[PDB]
RNA sequence: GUAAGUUUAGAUUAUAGCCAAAAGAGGGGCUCUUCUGGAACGGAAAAAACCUUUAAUAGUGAAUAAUUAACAACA
C-alpha cells in the first residue's frame, strides 16, 4: 500500500526511486474490470439511421411543416431552433471547398 | 515512457541509459509575417516582413538498456 | 457596346465522338433595344426562370405587363430559329434555362416645370437575355426531410476535430 | 488503445448525464459545480468550440 | 478604496529587503583616508584615452583605384 | 492575413529521410547574355563557383545557355514537380551563390503558414482519455438508483 | 501610368472584404492597413491565450484526480521535475496512466511536505523529499 | 492614349496572367517540353537515388508496349519491360511476404495475401512513381501515363535494380521506399474482414480457447439519440478485449476487432518496424 | 563614479501647452506664482495626465511587477 493514490480504477501505480537516486521508476500495469462488476449484454433483441427514422416519425399531416419539423429535430438533439435555419447564398459560397487534412 | 512503466530524470537521466537519434530533413524559412506599426498617419508603405529561417527534423530511433 | 450573347450562338462544337451522349441544344437569344426598364423587365425574367417553353408562353399570354408581350415575341423567335437552325426535332421540348435583363443606352432631355423648375429627363432602354436548353425543365427541389437534417448534424458532430493539441 | 478512429472520436466526444440532489443543499455551491459540469469544464480536453457540455439533472 | 490583503503583504516584503540593504551598507571596509588617491592613477589613464578618441575627426582620403575600378562595370564575356 | 491567406499542416513528401535522404531539386537552368551589365555577377559565377556546386551535388541537371537576353534568369525544378524561377538581373556572385544554396536545401513543399509544428502518426500510446476513465465500477454493474 | 498596379496591390488584400469597401480604393486601402495592424498585434496575444488554455486543461485533469492545480505544480518543482505546462497537457491527454503516476508522486510529496511541517524538522528528509 | 511602350508591354503580361488563370493549358509531358535530355536525366535520376542502374536495362524497364506502337505508327507513315516486370513483381511478393511474416508470425497466411496485394496496389505503385518523377521518365504513348502501364514499369525498374545492384540493395530499397507506406495504416484498413465475431470464434477453437461471454462493461445514454455502449468479451470470466460502440452490436463488433489485432500481435503500442538496420 | 567640456568662427529653428502632485500668495471652493512628474501595447471598469514598465525581433517556453475591494459594545 505504498502508493499514495487508489490503484483500483486506472492502473496499479508503483513509484520507486533508484538506489543512486538519479532516476525515478514508475510501473503502471493496467487493471481490467471485474466480471462480477459488469452486466451481461441485453439478452432480449442496428444502424443509427434506423433510430433516426423512428425518432423522427411522420405522424400528423403526412410530412410535417417546416416549423414543427425543426421543433421535432430540436427536441431530439436538445438544440435550439436557430441552428436548423438555412443560410443565404453569399455565406454558403464563402465556405472553403477543400480544407486541408493531414494524417 | 513504456507501455507499463516510465522513467523520470532528476532533472535528467544518465547518458548511458538513453540514446536518441534523429535526422535532418529540410532547411527552409517561414512564410511572411506582417510587422505593421500603429502610428498616426500610418501610411500604406510602413510595414516589415520577418520570414525567419527554419529547419525540419525527423525522429529516427530511441535506444535504452537495463543500466539501472 | 458589347454583343457577346450573339457570339455564344455562333459557337461551333467539335464533332462528337461515338462514345459521347447526344449534346443537348443551347440557344442564346436577346433583344438589345427595348423601351422598357430593366428592373421592371427583371421581375418577368425571374418568375419564368426554369419553366418549360409551353408553360412560359401560356403565362405570358395572360400577363398584363408590356414587357411580357415582348418576352413572348422574343421567345417565339428563339424557338423558330432553334428548329430551323439548331436542329431541334420537337417544338415542345424546350425550357427556360436562363432569363435576365440588362441596361441599354438611354436618351437625355431637360424636364421643364410649370413653376420655373427643371429636371433631368431620361428615356430608358434595356436589353433582355435568355438562354434556352433543349429538353423538359429540371425537376423542382424537394425540401429536406427531418431524417436528412438529423443525419447531417450527426455527421457534423463526428467530423469535429480536436483543436490546438498534440 | 487500438480502437477504430471513428469510434474513438465518438467515445472521446461523448456527453454524460449527471444527477444532483438539492435537498438541504445551497444553490450557489451547486450552481458552481453545475456550471462546471454543464459547460464541460470537467473534461481535461475542454475546448471553447468543441461543444463538450454535459447533461445535468437536479432534483 | 480599501487596500487588498495581497498589496499590504507585498510592500512589507519589499521593505524588509531594503532593510537588508541598510545593514550591508553599515560596515564600510575602507575608511575615508584610505580611499583618497587610491585609484587616481587609473582614472587619469582612462581620461587620456577618451581625449584621443574624441579628437580623431578628419576628412577622408581619395584614391586612384576608386576611379579606375569603375571601368570594370563594362566587363563582359569575350 | 491568416484569414485572407491559406495554411497547411506539417508534413513530409514521402518520408524522404526515413531510409535515405533524396534531394528534391532535380534541375537547374541558367540563362546568360554575353553583353549585359545585369549578368556580370552571373558571368563570373560560371567561371568560378558553378563547377564546385555541380561536383558537390551531381544529382541535379544543370543547363547553361548563353543567349541574347535582357535579364538573366534561373529556373529550379523539383522532383515533386514544383518549379521556381529567380531573376538574376544585376546580382553579384555572392548573392547568386547564397540563393542557390537555399534552393538546394528547400523542398518542393509549399511555403505557407503551418498550423502545427508537429506531425505524428501515433498520437496515443497508452490510449486516449475517455470519460469512463477513472470511474469506479459497482458489483453486478448496477446502474445508479437501480433497485435490482 | 502604373496606378492600376498600385490598385491591384490593395485589391489583392481587399478582395475578401464585404460591401463597397472591397471595391472602393478610398475605403479598401484603409481597411488593409487596419487588417495588417490587427494581425501584428494578435501575434503577441496568441501566445498568452495558448498558455491560458493549457493551464485550464491541466486544472481539469488535476481536478479529475482530486488534486488542485497549485498543489501539483509546487510538488513537481520540489521534486526537481522541469516539464513545461504545454508538455503536461500532452502527458495527461495521451498518457493518462503516466499522468496518474505523476499525480501520485506529487501527492506523496505534498503528504511528505505536510509531514515535514508536522514533524517540525526534527525528522529526517523523506525518501521522496531527498534533494 | 497614353504614350510609351513599357506600359503597353506591362498590360500584355496582365492579359496573359488572366488567360492562364481562366483557361489553364492541358497537361503535357516534360519530354515534349523544351530542355529535355533522356540520357542526362537518367544519370541524374540514378545518382539522386544513390543507386547504381544499368542504363541498357533501365531503358528497357522504362520502355512500354504502348510507346513502341506510337513510334511504330510514326515509323510506318526495342525491348518491352514485360520480362523485367515479371521479375520485380514476382520477387516483390516474396520480399513483401517475408517482411510481413517476420514481424507478424501470428498473422494468418490469408491476411498476408491481403496485405501484400494492398502494398502492390496500382494506386500505391502509381503514387510512388509520380512523386519520384518516374512518370516523366516513363516511356509511353499517352500523357498522363496510364496507371497499369506505370505499374508495369515500377516492377520492371525493380528487376533492373536487382541485376544492377543485387538483391541486397533492392531489399533495402523496398524497405526504405515501400515498407514506409504502411505507416499509419491499421490492420483492418489494409485487410478487409467481415463477420469478425465468427472469425474470432474460429481462431479461438483453433487455439482451444473457450468462446468469450459478451458483457456490458459500461453504458451511457441508452435511451437518448446518442447512445454509448462498451461491450467486453469475457473468456472464462476474464476480459480479453473491450470495444466502444454506439449500439450493442457495434460495441460487440468493435470488441471483436480489438481481439483480432491482439491475436495477431497488432497492438497499437507494438514495437515500430525498424528501417535503421544497415544489414 | 563616470565622459564629455571650454574657447573661436558661421547659422538658424523655437519663442501659446495640458493634467497630476508639492510649496507659497490673494479668496475665507476657487485665482495666481514657484518646484517635481507624466503621454502602455499591463493595471485602477471604460480611463492623454494615477501605478507597474529601458528600445524592437521570431518561438504552441520560463520567472516576475502593478493589480475592486474589504471583514451592535460590557468592563
From Swiss-Prot, chain A:
It is found in: Mitochondrion. Keywords: Mitochondrion, Ribonucleoprotein, Ribosomal protein, Transit peptide. The keyword Zinc does not apply. The keyword Transit peptide applies. GO terms for cellular component: mitochondrial inner membrane; mitochondrial large ribosomal subunit; mitochondrial small ribosomal subunit; mitochondrion; plasma membrane. It comes from the Eukaryota. GO terms for biological process: mitochondrial translation. Belongs to the mitochondrion-specific ribosomal protein mL42 family. Component of the mitochondrial ribosome large subunit (39S) which comprises a 16S rRNA and about 50 distinct proteins. Component of the mitochondrial ribosome small subunit (28S) which comprises a 12S rRNA and about 30 distinct proteins. This is Large ribosomal subunit protein mL42. It comes from Mus musculus (Mouse). The gene is Mrpl42.
Curated annotation (Swiss-Prot), chain B:
GO terms for molecular function: RNA binding; structural constituent of ribosome. GO terms for cellular component: mitochondrial inner membrane; mitochondrial large ribosomal subunit; mitochondrion. Keywords: Mitochondrion, Ribonucleoprotein, Ribosomal protein, Transit peptide. It is found in: Mitochondrion. Its main location: mitochondrion. GO terms for biological process: mitochondrial translation. Component of the mitochondrial ribosome large subunit (39S) which comprises a 16S rRNA and about 50 distinct proteins. Belongs to the bacterial ribosomal protein bL21 family. This is Large ribosomal subunit protein bL21m. The lineage of its organism: Eukaryota, Metazoa, Chordata, Craniata, Vertebrata. The gene is Mrpl21.
From Swiss-Prot, chain E:
It is found in: Mitochondrion. It comes from the Eukaryota. Its main location: mitochondrion. The keyword Membrane does not apply. Keywords: Mitochondrion, Ribonucleoprotein, Ribosomal protein. The keyword Protease does not apply. GO terms for molecular function: structural constituent of ribosome. One of its GO terms (cellular component) is mitochondrial ribosome. GO terms for biological process: mitochondrial translation; translation. Signal peptide: none annotated. Belongs to the mitochondrion-specific ribosomal protein mL63 family. Identified only in the intact 55S subunit. It is unknown whether it belongs to the 28S or to the 39S subunit. May localize at the subunit interface and dissociate from the 55S mitoribosome during subunit separation. This is Large ribosomal subunit protein mL63. The lineage of its organism: Eukaryota, Metazoa, Chordata, Craniata, Vertebrata.
Swiss-Prot record, chain H:
This is Large ribosomal subunit protein mL44. It is found in: Mitochondrion. Its main location: mitochondrion. InterPro entries: dsRBD_dom (IPR014720), Ribosomal_mL44_DSRM_metazoa (IPR044444), RM44_endonuclase (IPR055189), RNase_III_sf (IPR036389). Residues 56-187 form the RNase III domain. The keyword Secreted does not apply. Its EC number is 3.1.26.-. Belongs to the ribonuclease III family. Mitochondrion-specific ribosomal protein mL44 subfamily. GO terms for molecular function: double-stranded RNA binding; ribonuclease III activity. It comes from the Eukaryota. GO terms for biological process: mitochondrial translation; mitochondrial translational elongation; RNA processing. Component of the mitochondrial ribosome large subunit (39S) which comprises a 16S rRNA and about 50 distinct proteins. One of its GO terms (cellular component) is mitochondrial large ribosomal subunit. PANTHER family: LARGE RIBOSOMAL SUBUNIT PROTEIN ML44 (PTHR11207:SF5), RIBONUCLEASE III (PTHR11207). Residues 195-265 form the DRBM domain. Keywords: Endonuclease, Hydrolase, Mitochondrion, Nuclease, Ribonucleoprotein, Ribosomal protein, RNA-binding, Transit peptide. Disulfide bonds: none annotated. It holds the Pfam family DSRM_MRPL44. PROSITE patterns: DS_RBD. Component of the 39S subunit of mitochondrial ribosome. May have a function in the assembly/stability of nascent mitochondrial polypeptides exiting the ribosome.
